[PDB]
Design a protein around this nucleic acid. Structure first.
Ligand code: LSS
Ligand code: 9YN
Ligand code: ZN
Length: 860
RNA sequence: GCCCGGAUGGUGGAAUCGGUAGACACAAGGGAUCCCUCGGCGCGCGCUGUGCGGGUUCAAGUCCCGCUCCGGGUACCA
């Protein structure tokens, strides 16, 4: 051990020890108690960023902590390799997406090894390899034969000049990011998986997930959006078909003055042949991007179709209107608009001058004033024929039962949740195992012809996929006849839905899962990911677990016991307009900035000489080009210093605006720990610690040692507040510096403390603590060492602080015995001059007393 | 727009069940790697202070109602 702390010599040497000895390689050991510490696998974009390092340090801190308790901890790492950014990068850099991805896997693997995350590298997966995606292709064909898969048409962003399907990210300002030509909706046939079949199970089992956070669970409820209502069919005068609409408020059905309809609905298509104005409005609605954000933000417009739907109860002819705000996907592509008691319909009715009929009385029991706004609340009915006087309960059921008796309506459970559309029409993805025969019949790819291997070695023009462009690739022979297999590929969420299960048996050749191995590890004890994946991924992840359960693969109903959704790591994001309107995103490192007096950014110029558009703070990513590479800080300060800084700066769940300020405290702290152990070990081996033969300062120091162990254990294990745990050890270390190491009992006590501190820091800074553990003559490696347990008799308090208050303001503070009555606390508090100052010439009205904590005195 | 969260000294943050506001660090100034000072306004004291406006309470950063700004998701970014 040198006097100076030099990471570059220590860290890589300890990293080699873990690889050669295979410290974090684990098997299904029935003797040890199991623990699955899963962190969400990354997309190999190129470099790591401080978002990644936060996620994986949190996981590694938990994984090393649970090992030291004495459990067989599985912390796996893999690569969610398929994706869009590979194709964009491959075309620009003149490569194929496969070798580009494998380079980025190789680079980031070495960056993860540098950071020293104790992963099981024998279980390493890559989702782009056919050894992985063969099983999901086999799984997909089974789901089709169960009837959970079905084909239907779906809206897609389509640049008509290129003849290519764009993503939501690839559209910007309602325009194509490559070329100058506007995007439009194209209805295209695609494969869907019935996630709505498991909607009630996904909704109900949130109540059993008590160790998941209410933030994530509440978002998933609202996303699913279960809804009990009524379907109501209408007749339309000069129109051969009928219009069904969904509604949760059939009580207000008598106030339905019109019917709003979506743009692509066949009634609007039929009306637009004759009507020239509606033809212009439908073609305007083609420009509407496939996104709910842009749908609600844009102005609510509409056109009268010409048709008149007959209202079943009243018998009145009401106008059917085409409108943008009505979604095609939710409901049935049409609604019963009650503008009197719906703020969205009120504005539509007031704009285009439609009738606003009131049918619900206000809470006072009177006719509501609908001059400024609609009455959204529920109440008694009026001006509603036979249904007058009924409250919401009776009004709902009476009109439902009437419409059920008439045979023009029925009760139905609806979900906001749509089915999982898995068809993508890009190259870099697992191909869908479906075959179109020469017959015309569509059936699954046979088991002998699985997997449908995606050819890695290809050349991409950028417009069209090579497997689509080449006519030879699609050819096959099924059931003794020519056939064309599906050139569309899976959604990338498909691969990341079941990877957690595959980690348990990743080299299992004989099936999708080795259930003996899977049921040992599963379910997952802690799942560490970003808050971004609260809904989309986690809902698929849960859904896919339930499918594997229903195929007899896994025991549990839920995949993960505990969820730790960490907050995003934010960074500044800049860009400039290119010559062909191309958004070239510039990094914060390259941006030259002039700031505001408050703190905000005002001007922004890149190194070359372009006026940068400052978008704002946003999540670190390859897309916005705002990720900060840890490699620079790791080289300078060391992985331990970077790792400690990430955990110390902010609590896991809260978001973090990134800045390097604060690292120097983490660096200096680790030098102080190194220094104190150097000074301690230099004096030689210590005496055996006599517990009941210490001074009061030694007893108080030992109290703080075991109290820190109690706090650090609680803060990590129960709370996951790592910032408070690391701060608690800094307090103890600051106290241990001032402690005099003269006598043998002082050094005996300094041994116990330093053994505890090095073990408590180990999950955060494992490289430095591996070295310090050996230097203190600890048994074996620190990785396998037992986690320190706090002694109850050491933490005993004889006295306690009591804060004296006068009208809720602190005037004095006093030390009192723990078993002291309220009379003794008042008499003791009265002796303080600042307390006696505000009690002269006034009557004590009330005396509140929190036992051994606080004493307020209300004064008159 | 809708759903979910956040805002505390120059800066990141602490206060775990309504009960000492600013632990622990950074940056800054001053002294000799170590020590001192450090929310604001006028002292070994007094008032005030947790984005903004009301309310409940003996007591609110914490609970309630109404805003402002900022982030995440919004179904083809992963
Ligand atoms: C299961 C699967 C669908 C996961 C998917 N393959 C994936 O997300 N891959 S990844 O490379 O983008 O990220 C890996 C982990 O890191 C988190 N993360 C990402 N960006 C940030 C950020 N700016 N700040 C904080 N965390 C971030 C992210 O949530 C995830 O847990
Ligand atoms: C008195 C009000 C509530 C009547 C309103 N015109 C309506 O029927 N709203 C529908 C349902 O009450 C509710 C179901 O959650 O959402 C409305 N709705 C149904 N389908 C759609 C759709 N496709 N687009 C927009 N809103 C819709
Ligand atoms: Zn284009």
């Amino acid at each position: 051990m040198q006097e100076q702390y030099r990471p570059e010599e220590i860290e890589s040497k300890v990293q080699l020890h873990w690889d050669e000895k295979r410290t974090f390689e684990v098997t299904e050991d029935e003797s040890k108690e199991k623990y699955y510490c899963l962190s969400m696998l990354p997309y190999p974009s190129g470099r790591l960023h401080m978002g990644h390092v936060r996620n994986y340090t949190i996981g590694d801190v938990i994984a090393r902590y649970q090992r030291m308790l004495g459990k067989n901890v599985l912390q796996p790492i893999g690569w969610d390799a398929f994706g869009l950014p590979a194709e964009g990068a491959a075309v620009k850099n003149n490569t194929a997406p496969a070798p580009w991805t494998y380079d980025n896997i190789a680079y980031m693997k070495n960056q993860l090894k540098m950071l020293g995350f104790g992963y099981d590298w024998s279980r390493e997966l890559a989702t782009c390899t056919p050894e992985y995606y063969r099983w999901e292709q086999k799984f997909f064909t089974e789901l089709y034969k169960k009837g959970l898969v079905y084909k239907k048409t779906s809206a897609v962003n389509w640049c008509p000049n290129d003849q290519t399907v764009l993503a939501n990210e690839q559209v910007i300002d309602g325009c194509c990011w490559r070329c100058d030509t506007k995007v439009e909706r194209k209805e295209i046939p695609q494969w869907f998986i019935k996630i709505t079949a498991y909607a009630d199970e996904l909704l109900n089992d949130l109540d059993k997930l008590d160790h998941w956070p209410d933030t994530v669970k509440t978002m998933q409820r609202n996303w699913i959006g279960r809804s009990e209502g009524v379907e109501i069919t209408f007749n339309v005068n000069d129109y051969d078909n009928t219009l069904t609409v969904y509604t949760t408020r059939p009580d207000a059905f008598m106030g339905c003055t019109y019917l709003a309809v979506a743009a692509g609905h066949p009634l609007a298509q039929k009306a637009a042949e004759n009507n020239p104005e509606l033809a212009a409005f439908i073609d305007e609605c083609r420009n509407t991007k496939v996104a709910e954000a842009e749908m609600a933000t844009m102005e609510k417009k509409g056109v009268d179709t010409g048709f008149k739907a007959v209202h079943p109860l009243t018998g009145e002819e009401i106008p059917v209107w085409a409108a943008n705000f009505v979604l095609m996907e939710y409901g049935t592509g049409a609604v019963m608009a009650v503008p009197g008691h719906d703020q969205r319909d009120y504005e539509f009715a007031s704009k285009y001058g439609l009738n606003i009929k009131p049918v619900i009385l206000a809470a006072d029991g009177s006719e509501p004033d609908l001059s400024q706004q609609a009455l959204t609340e529920k109440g008694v009915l009026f001006n509603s024929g036979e249904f007058n006087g009924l409250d919401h309960e009776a009004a709902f059921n009476a009109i439902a039962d009437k419409l059920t008796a008439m045979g023009v309506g029925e009760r139905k459970v609806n979900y906001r949740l749509r089915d999982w559309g898995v068809s993508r029409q890009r190259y870099w993805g697992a191909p869908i195992p479906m075959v179109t025969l020469e017959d015309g019949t569509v059936m699954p790819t046979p088991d002998d012809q699985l997997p449908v291997i995606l050819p890695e070695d290809v050349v991409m023009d950028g417009i069209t996929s090579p497997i689509k462009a080449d006519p030879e690739w699609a050819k096959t022979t099924v059931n003794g006849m020519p056939a064309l297999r599906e050139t569309d590929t899976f959604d990338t969420f498909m691969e990341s839905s079941w990877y957690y299960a595959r980690y348990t048996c990743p080299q299992y050749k004989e099936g999708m899962l080795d259930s003996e191995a899977a049921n040992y590890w599963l379910p997952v004890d802690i799942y560490i990911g970003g808050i971004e994946h609260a809904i989309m991924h986690l809902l698929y992840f849960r859904f896919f677990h339930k499918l594997m359960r229903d195929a007899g693969m896994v025991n549990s109903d839920e995949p993960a016991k505990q969820l730790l959704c960490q907050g995003m790591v934010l960074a500044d994001a800049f860009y400039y307009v290119g010559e062909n309107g191309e958004r070239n995103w510039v990094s914060p490192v390259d941006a030259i900035v002039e700031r505001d007096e408050k703190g905000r950014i005002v001007k922004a110029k890149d190194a070359a000489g372009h006026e940068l558009v400052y978008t704002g703070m946003s999540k670190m990513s390859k897309s916005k080009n705002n990720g900060i590479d840890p490699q620079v800080m790791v080289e300078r300060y060391g992985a331990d210093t970077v790792r400690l800084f990430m955990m110390f700066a902010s609590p896991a769940d809260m978001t973090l605006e990134w800045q390097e300020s604060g690292v120097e405290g983490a660096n200096r702290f680790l030098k102080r720990v190194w220094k104190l152990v150097y000074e301690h070990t230099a004096k030689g081996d210590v005496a055996a610690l006599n517990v009941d033969a210490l001074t009061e300062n030694q007893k108080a120091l030992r109290r703080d040692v075991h109290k820190t162990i109690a706090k650090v254990t609680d803060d990590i294990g129960r709370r996951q507040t790592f910032n408070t745990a690391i701060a608690a050890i800094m307090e103890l270390m600051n106290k241990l510096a001032k402690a005099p190491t003269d006598g043998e009992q002082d050094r005996a006590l300094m041994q116990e403390a330093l053994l505890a501190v090095v073990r408590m820091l180990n999950p955060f800074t494992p490289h430095i603590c591996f070295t310090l553990w050996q230097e203190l003559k600890g048994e074996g490696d620190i990785d396998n060492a037992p986690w320190p347990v706090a002694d109850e008799k050491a933490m005993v308090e004889d006295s306690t602080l009591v804060v004296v208050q006068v009208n809720g303001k602190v005037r004095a503070k006093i030390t009192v015995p723990v078993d002291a009555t309220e009379e003794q606390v008042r008499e003791r508090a009265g002796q303080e001059h600042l307390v006696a100052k505000y009690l002269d010439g006034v009557t004590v009205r009330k005396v509140i007393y929190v036992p051994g904590k606080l004493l307020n005195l209300v004064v008159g």
